Amino acid sequence: GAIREDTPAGSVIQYSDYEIDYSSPFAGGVAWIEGEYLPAEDAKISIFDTGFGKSDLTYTVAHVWHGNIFRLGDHLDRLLDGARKLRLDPGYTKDELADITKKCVMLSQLRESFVNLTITRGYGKRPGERDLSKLTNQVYIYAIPYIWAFPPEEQIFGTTAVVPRHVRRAGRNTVDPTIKNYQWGDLTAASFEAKDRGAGTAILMDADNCVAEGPGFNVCIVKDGKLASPSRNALPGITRKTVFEIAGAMGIEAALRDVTSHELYDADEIMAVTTAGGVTPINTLDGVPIGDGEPGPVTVAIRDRFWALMDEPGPLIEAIQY
Amino acid sequence: AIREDTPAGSVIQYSDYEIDYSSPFAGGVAWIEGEYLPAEDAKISIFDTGFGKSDLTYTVAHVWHGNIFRLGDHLDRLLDGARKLRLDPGYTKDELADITKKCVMLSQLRESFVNLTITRGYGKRPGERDLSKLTNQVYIYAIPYIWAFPPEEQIFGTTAVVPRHVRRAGRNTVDPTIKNYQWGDLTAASFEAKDRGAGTAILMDADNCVAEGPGFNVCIVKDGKLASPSRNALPGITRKTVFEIAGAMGIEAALRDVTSHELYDADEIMAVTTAGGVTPINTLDGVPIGDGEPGPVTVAIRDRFWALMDEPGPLIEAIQY
Amino acid sequence: REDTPAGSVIQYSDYEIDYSSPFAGGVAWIEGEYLPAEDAKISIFDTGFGKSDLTYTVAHVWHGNIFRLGDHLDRLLDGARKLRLDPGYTKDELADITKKCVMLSQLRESFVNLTITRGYGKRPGERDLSKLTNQVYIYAIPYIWAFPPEEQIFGTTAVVPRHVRRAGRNTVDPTIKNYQWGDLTAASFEAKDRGAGTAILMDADNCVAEGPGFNVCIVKDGKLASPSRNALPGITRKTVFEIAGAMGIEAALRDVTSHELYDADEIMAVTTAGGVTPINTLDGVPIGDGEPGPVTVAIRDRFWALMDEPGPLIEAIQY
Amino acid sequence: IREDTPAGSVIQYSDYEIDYSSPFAGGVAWIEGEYLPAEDAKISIFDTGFGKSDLTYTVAHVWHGNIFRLGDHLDRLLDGARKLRLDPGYTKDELADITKKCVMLSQLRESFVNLTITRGYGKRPGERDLSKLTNQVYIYAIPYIWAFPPEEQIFGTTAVVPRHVRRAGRNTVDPTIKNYQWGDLTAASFEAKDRGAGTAILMDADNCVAEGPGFNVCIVKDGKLASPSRNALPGITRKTVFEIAGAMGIEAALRDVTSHELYDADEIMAVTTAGGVTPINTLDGVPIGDGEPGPVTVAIRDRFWALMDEPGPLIEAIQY
Ligand SMILES: O=C(CO)[C@@H](O)[C@H](O)[C@H](O)CO
Ligand SMILES: O=C(CO)[C@@H](O)[C@H](O)[C@H](O)CO
Ligand SMILES: O=C(CO)[C@@H](O)[C@H](O)[C@H](O)CO
Ligand SMILES: O=C(CO)[C@@H](O)[C@H](O)[C@H](O)CO
DSSP: OOSOOOOOTTSSOOOOOOOOOTTSTTTTOEEEETTEEEEGGGOEEETTOHHHHSOOEEEEEEEEETTEEESHHHHHHHHHHHHHHTTOOOSSOHHHHHHHHHHHHHHHTOSSEEEEEEEEEEEOSSTTOOOGGGOEEEEEEEEEEOOOSSOHHHHHHOEEEEOOSSOOOOOTTSSOTTSOOSOOHHHHHHHHHHHHTTOSEEOOBOTTSBBOOBTTBEEEEEETTEEEEESSSSOOOHHHHHHHHHHHHHTOOEEEEOOBHHHHHTOSEEEEEETTTEEEEEEEETTEESTTSSOOHHHHHHHHHHHHGGGSOSTTEEEOOO | OOOOOOOTTSSOOOOOOOOOTTSTTTTOEEEETTEEEEGGGOEEETTOHHHHTOOEEEEEEEEETTEEESHHHHHHHHHHHHHHTTOOOSSOHHHHHHHHHHHHHHHTOSSEEEEEEEEEEEOSSTTOOOGGGOEEEEEEEEEEOOOSSOHHHHHHOEEEEOOSSOOOOOTTSSOTTSOOSOOHHHHHHHHHHHHTTOSEEOOBOTTSBBOOBTTBEEEEEETTEEEEOSSSSOOOHHHHHHHHHHHHHTOOEEESOOBHHHHHTOSEEEEEETTTEEEEEEEETTEESTTSSOOHHHHHHHHHHHHHTTSOSTTEEEOOO | OOOOOTTSSOOOOOOOOOTTSTTTTOEEEETTEEEEGGGOEEETTOHHHHTOOEEEEEEEEETTEEESHHHHHHHHHHHHHHTTOOOSSOHHHHHHHHHHHHHHHTOSSEEEEEEEEEEEOSSTTOOOGGGOEEEEEEEEEEOOOSSOHHHHHHOEEEEOOSSOOOOOTTSSOTTSOOSOOHHHHHHHHHHHHTTOSEEOOBOTTSBBOOBTTBEEEEEETTEEEEOSSSSOOOHHHHHHHHHHHHTTOOEEEOOOBHHHHHTOSEEEEEETTTEEEEEEEETTEESTTSSOOHHHHHHHHHHHHHHHSOSTTEEEOOO | OOOOOOTTSSOOOOOOOOOTTSTTTTOEEEETTEEEEGGGOEEETTOHHHHTOOEEEEEEEEETTEEESHHHHHHHHHHHHHHTTOOOSSOHHHHHHHHHHHHHHHTOSSEEEEEEEEEEEOSSTTOOOGGGOEEEEEEEEEEOOOSSOHHHHHHOEEEEOOSSOOOOOTTSSOTTSOOSOOHHHHHHHHHHHHTTOSEEOOBOTTSBBOOBTTBEEEEEETTEEEEOSSSSOOOHHHHHHHHHHHHTTOOEEESOOBHHHHHTOSEEEEEETTTEEEEEEEETTEESTTSSOOHHHHHHHHHHHHHTTSOSTTEEEOOO
């Protein structure tokens, strides 16, 4: 399996130059399942894990770029906070999960990597146990080659979006988007609608015609040199957190607030932000260019800064010891 | 256990039989990636997007006294939803039926919970995102009978609350009209019902119409007529059976919007699901429905439902063990 | 009167009004008195104003015939019951006063409004509902078109709002006819801004609700459907379903999803104020061939014929 | 006119005599450019402010002869009118002059004051073109209206969350622009009355607190104040409450308040022009804290009433 793919020449996005030693069976991808390190290709879970049958779980995703894992501490904090709200117990400390995660990456030998930690309600002594008190919660962790929500070419030159005609985001009182979850029924439906409409992605609205988020990303808009991102029906994203910190360092006002359907359509810039590929300019909405139809200046400034962070020793990154 | 206690003399009784545990299939079978496995060995790829995106549909049938109930109706529903999700099981209705009946026959269970699941599946590499590159998977299993409500509550009734904090996901979000594993709202509602000391929750939709419950449809009776939600609810096969029973009894039955006012004013409320049948709901938010005991229409339909499992006819098929 | 298309099924009556009557052209009945429409005034302290605490119905008169007045009175009084309003008159008394307004107006084509408000007490600013006297206001004025005659015959255009949805049955309930048009007014402004004839609003689950002053019906594969939930139970819709049945056309009150609206073979607006309006395009996309559909035309032409045919649906005003 | 208030409480009507030889005594409306006695105030049945409730308004109170925050009221009224494409055809200063004259002619020292801007009517009844409708301004000053009785202001009221009704969302009948469209509020009030409660607190579509029938809701938890930011009127009483909270060193946030946070609150209060700050002792029959007015609610309520007598920029004495 490829550990690299093309990125625009000279751009802020470049994979590491290195060779993996495939004499190790862990080379290229690792999972940690029921306390054992496995080749990613061998990684299997009980079909009776209620994380399958009820999607009764939470998770987080972190990236590794140039051998640096990005904000793992913040990822573990959000994961464990969510698990606590779901009455889940990983049975491992934050530092224990940090060491297991870093070991997955190290065994993979991947310098660019998509890293998942999942906590499930789990399974009991026999299949089809339904008393939560009898289910042993499971931790599953994996590190695999880098995943792009949008290809490198779109990270640099922009993607396109539609607002679905047929779908809205599940609200915080249904399948709660503020706890990261695998329940993508609405997100999958929106993505199918964007693909059918020839667009790169979908931006979903909440029940009150406020911007929610997209399938695997938060949305930020810029209007009159100010940045806004949805406060209610949206994951509290760590990329969004990073974007707000960059904006403050640049003297750009950044508010978490309701962004109405009016404000989305009237935006000077629209961007997608996510762990899986960073900051994506959205050049077009429902076939209408935003600004001049190319990546906006705040979006370009913040994106370029984001990728620079992956090479600057400091609290946001930790070097994997390969 | 292949059995649990049921109220003595009640319409609910497990079969009296011995399983041969020399078979590694005894008590539980799964069919995964084209192979029959002991249930305890049944594992799937972590990279199946049926896990990472819950991108799948399923159905559940029951086996009672060695008889599988409305399997053809379950496969029709399963395959119709799969077509709506752009999934392809890569097996015919008849092929899935044979594989399903073989899982039960190998389990040796006369009372069984039978699941068929169709997932978007996995590509050649973990982290394939391109749907055209994902090979859809079928997983089938037959395990001991599962009760959405204990047998004691099937006969004596359960208690319900309407969540203060949760609503059922709408058909335009995580669509409840296609059976799915995305129980975020249903799990939250169950925890609230448990926190309040109730047997279960009845969730409303965005317009304060009844949706359904965690693993069941709701039916009400008012002035001798039955009604069940049409919009934000699974089209249940137990509900289908209940409407047929009602028809045969001369009782009008409508699939329609049931408002919050109508739920609270109901003469009777009942839960209906594959996993345990027809459950009387005695109280709603601590207020007795009728006299706070199983209603007369509910009892008549529940008892008729169980009688169907022993009557030769087109709704049942005997597993040939 | 105003222009209608030459030779079409819509034609005003040929007659002259005697303007020696101060009632000629418009009559209201307010606080037990018939008045010229030009003089019809209500107390500002009617809570029908300050809380929009009221229901109403609208009937039309065409060629001197009032259409389904009994059904209109039934619907008005049923909603007034749900609102705990009491008009303090019987159905037959209201029917007599209604026909008298039309007669005094001399209008052969007329828009007829019956409103029941929560009313006012002895003191402005009375808030105790038990101390408010409910009020009945009735008027008959020249015919009002939700769509012009030209659009009745040749069709209009619609958009689905980007920014607005219909209030649900559990908020400001559309199943009880009301003056609370905040959403409908926002949707109409959005359609105007977007160069469209009108708006079709969605409910919270992306099911068709209705439009600003009309129900929506679709045709798909020769079958008619109209929303069952977040929509007024229209008397034009009731008529359309009776016409469809008599034509051998299957007609269902059910949820119509956003998918089914956009995929429809035909779309129509139905309302008392102008009848059955073909909708040629939705968000700029032609419905069928972008001209009034065959079911829509058959039902619209039948609807206008019902106005002139003696029977239970019509009663001739005695002028 | 006055009614009983609790003896020695922070709420007391003025002691004074109206001269009823003026026909304006006790109540005045300003309709179609004419000052009228309230009893004679009538509007065209064809104003689309009636038939479409196509209007906005605001309500100010007069207490001890002082009108409270009229400029804020006028700013909020006119901002909402611009959003509705309404034009009063009067300046903020002209509307202020007309408002204060209604109060002066009424002789009321305690008054409920309404300013309404409607889409209006055309030359013909039933005119269908908005561009041909002349927008109307209607203003009145009448005796003080209480959302909750003085006894409840001092000793607290009770509330329920409706089983059957929710607040209309900002994308339907928008609660962020003051309106007469009370269909949900009226239904909620009927359900509270059926359940024997003082009032209803409505939720939005996501089970966040919206507001009540004529008031904003504020909660206190762990000594901090919160009030809904989305589906709720931007109240001037709420604005005052937040200024009073800041002055007292009490953290106050406009934010989503979940249904969890409402039921878990240490204090709940109703805030509105028509009676001020009302303690809510009980929710769905369960005591909030000890089932008596909470300490933050009492300190803010008493401060709010003291404001009506302190010379300062929030009040203007009516020159009778
Ligand atoms: O592209 C995606 C979806 O795959 C990213 O948003 C990321 O993967 C998410 O964290 C989990 O899938
Ligand atoms: O997981 C379950 C069992 O709890 C459900 O999928 C199943 O449908 C059952 O019919 C209701 O419990
Ligand atoms: O039938 C009606 C009654 O309201 C509406 O269609 C009418 O057109 C509206 O009152 C004016 O637009
Ligand atoms: O300001 C208010 C809110 O109280 C008034 O709009 C209302 O008419 C009356 O108080 C409600 O009963």
